[PDB]
Amino acid sequence: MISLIAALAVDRVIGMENAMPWNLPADLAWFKRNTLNKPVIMGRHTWESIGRPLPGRKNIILSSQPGTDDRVTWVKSVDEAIAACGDVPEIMVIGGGRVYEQFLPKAQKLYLTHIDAEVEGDTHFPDYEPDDWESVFSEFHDADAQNSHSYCFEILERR
C-alpha cells in the first residue's frame, strides 16, 4: 500500500524556495509518528531541504543522476523506488510536489495536515479529485503557545 503524507497551507501551498517557512511542532510530531519504522520516498529537492537522513526509516531518494551519499538509497524511477521498499505493509511518500504528482494515482491513503496560514509559495500539492476520497479521521486544533496557527489532521482513503 502506498500513502502520501503532506502539510498544506492555504491554496495547497507546500513550499517556497525549497523550504517550509512555517514552524508547527505538533505537525512534525504527527509526521514522525506516522512515518517511523516505514520506508519513506522523497525527491532530490526534498532530500536537500531536509538535509540529513531521517532516523528509524529507510530513506529512498528519487533522482535521475547518481547518488552522492551512501547513508540513503538512490533510485532512478518510480517502479525502482517501490521495489526498493520490499514487502512492507505501507510505503510513505513524503514529497515534494513533482513526486506527489507521480504517486497520487497509485496511493490508497492520504495523511494531510491543513494549516490555517497564508503562504507565498512556489510548490503546490496536486489537485486531487474529492469524489475519489473518503475522510476516515479528522482532528482540529486551535493555535497555542507552541503552534502559531490552527491546523487540522485528516486521513483520507481512496473509495
Ligand X SMILES: Nc1nc(=O)c2nc(CNc3ccc(C(=O)N[C@@H](CCC(=O)O)C(=O)O)cc3)cnc2[nH]1
76 makes contact with ligand NAP (CB under 6 A): yes
Using CB under 6 A, which of the segments 44-52, 103-111, 126-134, 140-148 binds ligand NAP?
Answer: 44-52
Q: Which three cell numbers stand for residue 117?
A: 496560514
Is residue 113 near ligand X by the rule CB under 6 A? Answer: yes
Q: Which residues contact 143 (CB under 8 A, 6 or more apart)?
A: 116, 149, 150
Is residue 10 at the binding interface for ligand X, with CB under 6 A as the rule? no
Contacts of 23 (CB under 8 A, 6+ apart): 148
The neighbouring-strand residues paired with 138 are 154
What mask of x and - would describe binding to ligand X in positions 23 to 62, judged by CB under 6 A? Answer: ----xxxxxx-------------x---x---x--------
- SS3 for 25-73, per residue? HHHHHHHHHHHCCCCEEEEHHHHHHHCCCCCCCCEEEECCCCCCCCCCE
| Interface with ligand NAP (CB under 6 A) | 6-7, 14-15, 18-20, 42-46, 49, 62-65, 76-78, 94-99, 102, 123
Q: Which residues are annotated as a binding site?
A: 5, 7, 13-19, 27, 45-46, 52, 57, 63-64, 76, 95-102, 113
